[PDB]
Amino acid sequence: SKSTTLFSRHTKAIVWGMQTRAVQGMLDFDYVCSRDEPSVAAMVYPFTGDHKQKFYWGHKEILIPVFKNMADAMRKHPEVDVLINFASLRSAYDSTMETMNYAQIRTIAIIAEGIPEALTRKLIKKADQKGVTIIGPATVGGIKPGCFKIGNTGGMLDNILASKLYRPGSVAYVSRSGGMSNELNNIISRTTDGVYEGVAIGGDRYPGSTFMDHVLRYQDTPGVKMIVVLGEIGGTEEYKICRGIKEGRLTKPIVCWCIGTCATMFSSEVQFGHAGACANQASETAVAKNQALKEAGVFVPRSFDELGEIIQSVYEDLVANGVI
Amino acid sequence: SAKAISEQTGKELLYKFICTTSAIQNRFKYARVTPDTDWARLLQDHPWLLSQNLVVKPDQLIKRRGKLGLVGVNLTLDGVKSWLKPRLGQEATVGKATGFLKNFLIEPFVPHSQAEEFYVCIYATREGDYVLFHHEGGAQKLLVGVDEKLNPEDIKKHLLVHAPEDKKEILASFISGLFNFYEDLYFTYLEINPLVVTKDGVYVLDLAAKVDATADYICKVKWGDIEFPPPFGREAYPEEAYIADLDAKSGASLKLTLLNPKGRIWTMVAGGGASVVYSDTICDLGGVNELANYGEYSGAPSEQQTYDYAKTILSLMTREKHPDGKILIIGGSIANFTNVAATFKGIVRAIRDYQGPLKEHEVTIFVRRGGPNYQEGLRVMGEVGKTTGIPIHVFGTETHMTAIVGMALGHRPIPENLYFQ
Ligand SMILES: Nc1ncnc2c1ncn2[C@@H]1O[C@H](COP(=O)(O)OP(=O)(O)O)[C@@H](O)[C@H]1O
Ligand SMILES: O=C(O)C[C@@](O)(C(=O)O)[C@H](O)C(=O)O
Ligand SMILES: Nc1ncnc2[nH]cnc12
Ligand SMILES: [Mg+2]
Ligand SMILES: [Mg+2]
């Protein structure tokens, strides 16, 4: 367990990469959330020299500095405590290790897919030593309505508005899938008072931060009243939720569905899109994990099809009892 | 992802690269046999096949071969050929998977006692690599942390407590070299069962392994043109290699695995997660035996990349007709940043180019998608259906993501009041 709270409406970030569309998407979100200031203070991109990039704060053109060297960006922007890393898979390891030499950075998002698992374990070790939360690799990131969104998460303004992501509700989620996190934004906005915070941990075998890492944050966050987990075949992370409920650590209602039930019906092993989504023992299948979660008191729909219906039912019970 | 390699591949790398004081015996003494083998040429290249008796077994990622009668032990060359007669080229079922036995390894028989069989395994976890040792091979276990070394003295101290005293030096040297080899070549799983140590040295009788295939950019010099075989019960297809080559060329993700080339249910779904959920839904509704593929495209591929992806699928689904026609499920979540207009324009271009075959094969297309510019994407899908005469039913963010699966399979009515929304 590291920090309970990663982001706020005052969070400032450095973006590593020439990702102007993603930065402008963040700023569009920042503006409709009524943030005082843009969430991106600076960019780092070693393939160009120092310069300024034009962005828009509402209708107003503003300038965000781009630095060739990370050290200059950090020095000029001590207020920054988040780095979003769009480095390619080839250099994501080195740039992330470098970021962790700056004590101001407490959260890093790693976008790239295709980082070797042995390199990610070394990132995890250094991040655990320093108490830095890593989201990713191989992720779109996450979104904290009203406060901060990572990169491309949640798309452009039309989707931010449609799914009510400009102000927080009471429902937190954690997902193995980038695209499905935006489907969760949609479902939760239609069935509850909306997303409080959502994180996509990415599809890799060793996510920089796990399901239980975030579930615990949400349990410890007063504004969160219920928690949704979109799990997946592969590994045994989801049994930690069973354990936390049994221990009395997790007391808020948890909804969870693990995708990958089809694998149980195939006659040979199938590697799915996410690098981590392959069951190496019977306990790693989605069917086994869904069954264990149901027996531990997690709210588990019969299939993905019924996920919205069970979220709504849990939400409405919490309202009825005065929790929301 | 971590991918299995053949026993031959793993032994070749080990014999090439491991560093030990131990004299590893029978280095590179293996011969590969398939139904097309020219046996005269095989024997010209491997004269040691006549020098002592042999062991023969399939090398196709089949576990527990000995229990299946699939290891022929202590045979002459004639005995190997007799043993292969009812097996080589034959269909076999292993577990629940069925495939052809078509790739075998022949190696020298190593006489040894049961006491000379050891077990060694190394495998990766979040917290480091566990190293396992057992003196009854054919179990001590130590976590090696991410930044830790594994020296011979560490192996003696932590793992060899039950090992025969006269074999600790050679075992500790071998296991130390094995671990450095595992790290240097980016293995995630490496099992040698049995490792045999006789008076004459170390013999690697069996090897199973996985490597982290994402490390090719680091390891390619040492790995060479490494092959990752499909699981037993599946074939490799040219279309899969074509898509894999596309996947390697940019940051976009393009994946295709053929499950049943003759299946009438085809998917072309965006995203790792959504593609799994749609597959789950298809199988929940009884379609597992008709599901032709698993795959996904995602990470904002271009119009051209998506056209090249789609045309591969449309080609694959118009090879042979099905009495009841076929179904194409073009689905996805509400995308975060994939350009739905650009990608759907590429698919529409493929549909146009294949409209003849698609009508001949009685394909019905169901679409559900949201994301950047999805309204224009849905429009062009509707339009190509109108201009080709192919039936296409187009849905947006107001339709539940997987509802089109039930529609396509007849379990629920098609709601035209939701078109394009
Ligand atoms: N070259 C060999 N010389 C002697 N015995 C062997 C040899 N290869 C295999 N065996 C014996 O046959 C057993 C089964 O073979 P193995 O390759 O371990 O296959 P599996 O583990 O799939 O059953 C081994 O554990 C060993 O006892
Ligand atoms: O197109 C999709 O639905 C998936 C995705 O590309 C997206 O834009 O949300 C996602 O980021 C991923 O990488 O799978
Ligand atoms: N021994 C062999 N038999 C048949 N084809 C081969 N290709 C390479 N070596 C061969
Ligand atoms: Mg064996
Ligand atoms: Mg993906």
Side-chain angles (χ1 to χ4, degrees), chain B residues 65 193-194 206:
Chain B
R65 295 166 289 194
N193 183 26
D206 187 14

Side-chain angles (χ1 to χ4, degrees), chain A residues 113 138 176-179 203 273-275, chain B residues 253 255 271-273 296-299:
Chain A
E113 188 169 34
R176 245 256 195 261
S177 165
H274 291 156
Chain B
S253 175
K255 312 278 191 281
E296 61 100 358
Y297 68 99
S298 56

Side-chain angles (χ1 to χ4, degrees), chain A residues 114 116-117 121-122 124-125 152 154-155 178-179 182-183 186 190 206-208 260-262 266-270 273 305, chain B residues 96-97 124-126 128-129 146-147 212 214 217 231 234 273 276-277 280 294 333-337 368 397-398 401-402:
Chain A
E117 289 167 15
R121 292 192 305 193
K122 289 178 181 169
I124 286 165
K125 178 167 190 277
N152 296 130
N182 205 28
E183 198 69 39
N186 165 65
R190 296 180 191 257
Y206 311 125
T261 57
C262 60
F266 297 150
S267 63
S268 60
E269 175 191 277
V270 178
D305 284 12
Chain B
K96 339 172 292 195
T125 66
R126 186 181 188 88
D129 303 290
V146 158
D147 285 333
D212 186 349
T214 68
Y217 73 102
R234 300 220 301 267
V276 174
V277 177
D280 291 348
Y294 170 77
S333 76
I334 305 174
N336 299 276
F337 70 97
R368 188 277 192 174
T397 57
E398 303 311 296
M401 185 181 82
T402 63

Side-chain angles (χ1 to χ4, degrees), chain B residues 32 34 36-43 45-46:
Chain B
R32 178 187 192 166
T34 79
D36 299 342
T37 290
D38 174 6
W39 282 83
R41 178 175 166 194
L42 189 81
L43 265 295
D45 294 333
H46 300 100

